[PDB]
Ligand binder design. Structure first.
Ligand SMILES: CCCCCCCCCCCCCCCC(=O)O
Ligand SMILES: [Cl-]
Length: 174
């Protein structure tokens, strides 16, 4: 019944870059193929005088054969016609860390409590996503309040992802 076409997904109306700035803690993540960020994931968003948004991120990533490593990542966002949909160019401070360019959608936020992020890296031929990821962020590293949690689960469902998230732990690893 429900529409899982990416073109159908609602995003944050009149998204406000300035209100979104600051520290966000990742509480949950839906992983893409070849996942990168594992846990202890903390993002820092900024915006400059030109209205350009950027971010940094810290997190554990496990390179294969079980090598752990606290990644330090950088992101810069190019605006689109939709104030909540961006193109994110990202890279690591270390050259060998993953780089690329993903869609970056702010699906919902209230700025001071919760945020839901979404990226489809590759579409199916029917408009659904073939390879997606999503972060749920909290301003409080101890988690969301119940009201926010309930809103977020709804958004997760609307993205057709609700069954596919895992919790992100924060234990000072970085
Ligand atoms: C959306 C994450 C926070 C955005 C902050 C950008 C900092 C670099 C972003 C790195 C993108 C790589 C994370 C997607 C890959 C993954 O986690 O599986
Ligand atoms: Cl579920």
């Amino acid at each position: 019944e429900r529409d899982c076409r990416v073109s159908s997904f609602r995003v944050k109306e009149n998204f406000d870059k300035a209100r979104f700035s600051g520290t966000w803690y990742a509480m949950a993540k839906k992983d893409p193929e070849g996942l990168f960020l594992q846990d202890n994931i903390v993002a820092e968003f900024s915006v400059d005088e030109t209205g350009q948004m950027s971010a940094t991120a810290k997190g554990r990533v496990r390179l294969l054969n079980n090598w752990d490593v606290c990644a330090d990542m950088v992101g810069t966002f190019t605006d689109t016609e939709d104030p909540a949909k961006f193109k994110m160019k990202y890279w690591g401070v270390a050259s060998f860390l993953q780089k690329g360019n993903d869609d970056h959608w702010i699906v919902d936020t209230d700025y001071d409590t919760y945020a839901v992020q979404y990226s489809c890296r590759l579409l199916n031929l029917d408009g659904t996503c073939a390879d997606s990821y999503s972060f749920v962020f909290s301003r409080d590293p101890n988690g969301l309040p119940p009201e926010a949690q309930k809103i977020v689960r709804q958004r997760q469902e609307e993205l057709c992802l609700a069954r596919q998230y895992r919790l992100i732990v924060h234990n000072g690893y970085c």
